[PDB]
Paper text:
Insect Toll receptors perform critical functions in both embryogenesis and innate immunity. Toll receptors are activated by a complementary family of six cytokine-like molecules called Spaetzle (Spz). Three oligomeric states of the receptor were observed at near-atomic resolutions, suggesting that [name] is highly dynamic in the presence of [name].
A third particle was observed with a stoichiometry of 3 receptors and 1 ligand. Homodimers of [name] at 3.41 Å maximum resolution had 85,810 particles, 2:1 heterodimers of [name] bound to [name] at 4.23 Å had 40,153 particles, and a 3:1 heterotrimer at 3.74 Å had 42,866 particles. The three [name] molecules observed are referred to as chain A (teal), chain B (dark blue) and chain C (powder blue) in superimposable conformations in all three structures (RMSD below 2 Å). While binding of a first [name] ligand shifts the receptor to adopt an asymmetric dimer configuration, the second binding site remains predominantly associated to another receptor chain. The N-terminal region of [name] (chain B) deviates by an angle of ~60°, compared to the axis traversing chain C from N- to C-terminus. None of these techniques detected the heterotrimer, which is therefore most likely a side effect of cryo-EM’s capacity of visualising transition intermediates.
Residue numbers in the entry:
A (entry chain P): 7 to 97
B (entry chain D): 7 to 102
C (entry chain B): 34 to 603
D (entry chain C): 220 to 411
E (entry chain A): 32 to 219
Write the structure that this text describes.
Amino acid sequence: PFLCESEQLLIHPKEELSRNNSMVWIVNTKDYKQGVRIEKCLKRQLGKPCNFCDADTECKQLFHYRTLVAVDKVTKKPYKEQVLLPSCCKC
Amino acid sequence: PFLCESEQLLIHPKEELSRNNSMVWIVNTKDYKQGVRIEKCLKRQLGKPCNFCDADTECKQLFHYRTLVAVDKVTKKPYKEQVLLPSCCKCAKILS
Amino acid sequence: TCPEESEASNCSCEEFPSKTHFYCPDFNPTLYVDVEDRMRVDFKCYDEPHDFKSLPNLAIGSVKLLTVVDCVLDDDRPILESFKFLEVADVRSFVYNNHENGIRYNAKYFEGMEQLENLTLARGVVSIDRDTFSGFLNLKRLTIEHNKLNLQPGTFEALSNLTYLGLVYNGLNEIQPGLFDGLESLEALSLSYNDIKSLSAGSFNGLSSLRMLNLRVNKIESFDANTFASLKELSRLEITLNPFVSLPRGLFSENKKLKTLILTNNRKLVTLPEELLANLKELTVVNLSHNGVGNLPESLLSGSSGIIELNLGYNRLNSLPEELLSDQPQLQVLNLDHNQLESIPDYFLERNVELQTLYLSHNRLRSLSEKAFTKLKNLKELHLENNQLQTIPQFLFSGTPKLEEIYMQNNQLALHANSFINEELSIADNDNTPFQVLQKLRILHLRNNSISTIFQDWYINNLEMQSLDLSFNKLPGLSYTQLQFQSNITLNLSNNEISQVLLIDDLDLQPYQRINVDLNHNPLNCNCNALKFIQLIQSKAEHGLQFNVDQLRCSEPPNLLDATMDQLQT
Amino acid sequence: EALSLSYNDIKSLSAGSFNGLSSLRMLNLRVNKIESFDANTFASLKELSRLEITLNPFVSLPRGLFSENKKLKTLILTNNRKLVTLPEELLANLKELTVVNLSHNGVGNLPESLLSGSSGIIELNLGYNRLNSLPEELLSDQPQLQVLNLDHNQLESIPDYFLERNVELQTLYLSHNRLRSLSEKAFTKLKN
Amino acid sequence: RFTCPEESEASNCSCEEFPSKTHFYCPDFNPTLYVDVEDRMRVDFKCYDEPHDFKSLPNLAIGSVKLLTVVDCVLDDDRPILESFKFLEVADVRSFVYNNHENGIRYNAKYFEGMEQLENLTLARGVVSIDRDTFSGFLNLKRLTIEHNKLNLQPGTFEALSNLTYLGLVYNGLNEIQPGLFDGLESL
Ligand SMILES: *[C@@H]1O[C@H](CO)[C@@H](O[C@@H]2O[C@H](CO)[C@@H](O[C@@H]3O[C@H](CO)[C@@H](O)[C@H](O)[C@@H]3O)[C@H](O)[C@H]2NC(C)=O)[C@H](O)[C@H]1NC(C)=O
Ligand SMILES: *[C@@H]1O[C@H](CO)[C@@H](O[C@@H]2O[C@H](CO)[C@@H](O[C@@H]3O[C@H](CO)[C@@H](O)[C@H](O)[C@@H]3O)[C@H](O)[C@H]2NC(C)=O)[C@H](O)[C@H]1NC(C)=O
Ligand SMILES: *[C@@H]1O[C@H](CO)[C@@H](O[C@@H]2O[C@H](CO)[C@@H](O[C@@H]3O[C@H](CO)[C@@H](O)[C@H](O)[C@@H]3O)[C@H](O)[C@H]2NC(C)=O)[C@H](O)[C@H]1NC(C)=O
Ligand SMILES: *[C@@H]1O[C@H](CO)[C@@H](O[C@@H]2O[C@H](CO)[C@@H](O)[C@H](O)[C@H]2NC(C)=O)[C@H](O)[C@H]1NC(C)=O
Ligand SMILES: *[C@@H]1O[C@H](CO)[C@@H](O[C@@H]2O[C@H](CO)[C@@H](O)[C@H](O)[C@H]2NC(C)=O)[C@H](O)[C@H]1NC(C)=O
Ligand SMILES: *[C@@H]1O[C@H](CO)[C@@H](O[C@@H]2O[C@H](CO)[C@@H](O)[C@H](O)[C@H]2NC(C)=O)[C@H](O)[C@H]1NC(C)=O
Ligand SMILES: *[C@@H]1O[C@H](CO)[C@@H](O)[C@H](O)[C@H]1NC(C)=O
């Protein structure tokens, strides 16, 4: 029912990609833990073209920026500096 | 190109106001905003059937949930939040 | 066609299109007589009596519907005889009004009147004989209204084909047990505006095929336990304005075909009997509003799974049983407003799934369990207005994604800016609130609430909001950030405590998108840094934002106290 | 703007009754006891498009009654009581009147120049007039009309030259009449 | 209202309750397996990354599900499905969906031994071939749907079926509709 199919995941990320590019040791301690819904695109479908249509378009994968305390292990130290994370698949 | 007319939008964080200060203040805080980024379809304001794919379709708006859970410092009951943000706008095939 | 040789007759034919009026005493207007193209005649003697003793004939021929208004009759004579001059043929409906003369009836009056369906006597029959209707061949309907009548048993002896016997303002004082004996095939019975005292179980003996009974105004004080037993075919019962204080047990357990039951204005009614509506698989619309019911039996609606709508408004009910709504998964529209209801039992509604709209207004509500709405996947409206809900659960709207319109006007809810979506530990880009979860929410009415803040989710999660009512709030100020709705929205911030409006010149909405914001009756400071706002009001041509800012006036700057915006000089 | 007198007990009409109102376009008299008139009664009402008088015992009318008002679009005279005759040139040179009805008036005579000069008429009725004879044969001089009803009249003969002006006359009624014969020349112009 | 009866740290499989849906995931950090559970109707069993076993996982008491869904999960050889998912305790099921992306297998009636009251069904992929009758005439199979399968059928393979109010084929790659393939669809 979808031209592009995305596997849903919860990541609880550490050292996630970011804008500043200086975000390492993200906080997922068992007491202070942050997770983020992501829509990973299916591996075999990264470049194979979208189905249910004749579009020559492939199922490309976007990215988006989310607020997480990834800059430092201590929580609220970066005031939720924006981290880069995967987003849905769009042809 | 993409199947749906999705447009990036920036949302500024809610600004704390010092209404206590009757005196004017620097708009520099108003000048720069960290902000957040979202996505929405204006495809007929998210109504387009994703025209150039002819299969029975209608563009949908999709959301993502962030789960931050911390046991309270006063060792109260564990506090969990699931903030929801419009994240993508995607097209889906439909029956008849 | 008008009557030729009109010179001899006193009557005058007006020869309108499809009419033919008459005023037979030409000198003094009287007997206004018209004819609707042989489909219907009419006849009014309003002025003076006995004026038609020697009238010339009119030769109307045959006509379907006759109507006589306020005209005298000759007692021992069949009606057509008294109006022989009309020369009607094959009357098919005979509506009579007699404001003036009360005439006893009998069989003789309707001699020659057969082949007649719609009979009707408004003030015509003061008293009815036992043999009056026997002459009729087939009589589809009947109706006597606006007269004090005395009824003897079995007067409707041989009206077998009768249907919709209607009595309005007839005010019979008591139904004789044999009143309806010998009568069948009634698709309707009217007891509205009657003076009936009680209903003996034999009072409905004759009826077998009745399908609809109405008691819009009745003085019935008591029912017999099996009053409605004989009414096996019944399909709708309406009771309004009845002084009965209680019902007999199992009263309706016999009328299994019943479809709609309505009880309204039973101010004396206080306690419904147990299992009153049990096991009526057909039932589809039950209304018990405006009564004085105090507390509901748990098994009121056991086994009555066919309900679609249920209504209990305006009662004095105080506390409710979960078992009542356990087996009605077809229900669509519930109502509980104006009760003295205090708190919804948490698991009250977890059984239904079809419930479109819900009403709870005008109660004494204090709080709601998160589990209250856990199962209403198809809900689309909600009315929590006029309820003393000081606080709400954060995880309230988890299970109702299709919610459209929600109204909490005159609520005691006071969710603050923080402490509604945060515990000072986790920062959220979009506030986590029950309103945030309902993305498809559009119309909201939080007017008279004290939240004093605007939630970020309202314009992030709720993309299609169209009407926001934030009136009578304690909000300190409005910020441009707190109004980037983008989508067409009506913003009301009137009667608020707002004093600071912060904008930025680069403010611009999506093209063709216009939002109206109202700021009247606010104590608005007018020192500097409100300047950009004055620029967006004064010397404003056109933009996305509009401002119903008529009654606003600067409050605090003393030099400009109470000067309206247009008054003000930048 | 609009004035009506239906089921009124008024037994007379004064000339000064209707003064103080240049802009009146509607006058209705469905029933009245009025038996007197005056040509100046309606004079002030120059803009009176419609005048309807019915169920009135007036035996006759004054000359130049409706002549003063040139803006009169319609005139109705139905169920008149003992109206023996009509004044000559009552509607002379109206130029605006489209419909004139004299039905149910007990008139024994007809005037050739009563309707002369009204080049707007499209409907004309004389129903139940019971004219002992038709004196007027020059009523076609306003031939623009298309309808006519002369039914329930006692006229013995129909004038040969009565119908030589009109060609657009669509509909005609002559029933309940005393007609011994029909003119061989009168029907040659009724093309429509 | 099960709410993970077994202790979490024993199997490290943690879950959270909400009014909507008591979610679940086992690895507790970067979770490979997710058991979404609507309180009454839905069930979502998803293992996008390979699952080591179905025994160390606890036993989530669930009465019945008006709908079930298995996603990208290996199915046991010649077992009933619920037999394979014995740990996932579910008794009465009406609908069904199955979307095995990887390691497709042929099918049988054995795979449906304990699932013979299925109003619907769907095998979104991984369908090599349906050797024997899909259902042994199992009750009220109102709808059916196999898609993206790239299979090849036999004529009248479906004849045992009668109440298929709807049958759906998408991306079947099937070269030719063998004659009489739709033989038994009396009430289609
Ligand atoms: C909010 O409501 C306003 C109505 O006040 C909507 O305005 C309408 O917007 C559409 C496009 O956004 C306009 O259509 C345009 O028409 C011109 C021709 O005039 C055409 O050249 C354009 O290509 C476009 O089709 C429409 O005229 C306009 N109508 C009015 C009365 O303003 C607006 O669309 C609504 N926005 C949302 C988000 O609901
Ligand atoms: C098995 O799958 C079928 C899918 O057709 C499910 O039944 C169908 O459920 C849909 C809900 O999306 C029903 O559609 C709604 O139906 C009503 C009544 O006809 C209609 O007024 C609405 O506009 C809308 O179409 C549909 O009626 C219903 N039945 C059919 C034959 O389609 C069924 O629930 C599934 N079984 C299980 C156990 O989940
Ligand atoms: C397709 O639908 C029909 C009808 O819905 C199914 O036939 C039904 O099969 C069941 C299974 O045996 C029958 O139930 C049995 O009924 C008897 C008599 O009441 C009872 O003694 C048994 O204990 C059992 O309950 C049911 O009567 C029967 N209905 C009809 C109308 O024949 C059929 O099985 C469905 N599937 C296929 C593949 O046809
Ligand atoms: C007797 O009364 C009934 C009740 O009005 C008449 O039936 C109506 O007829 C009209 C004519 O088309 C319909 O528009 C209504 O819907 C009918 N109502 C009902 C309840 O049937 C009937 O025509 C009357 N018959 C006579 C002879 O007067
Ligand atoms: C009730 O109506 C029925 C028909 O609707 C009448 O039945 C007819 O009765 C006459 C004599 O009474 C017979 O000659 C006919 O053969 C009957 N026809 C039918 C179709 O039944 C019946 O008479 C009416 N009775 C009353 C009391 O109104
Ligand atoms: C705002 O809401 C409050 C609380 O509902 C309203 O105060 C009530 O007013 C009614 C009618 O006068 C009284 O019967 C209640 O006793 C009042 N309750 C309390 C606790 O004060 C108030 O009138 C509303 N104001 C509006 C309409 O804006
Ligand atoms: C806004 O609310 C106030 C008070 O509730 C009311 O007086 C005003 O008319 C409202 N404005 C609109 C546009 O409805």
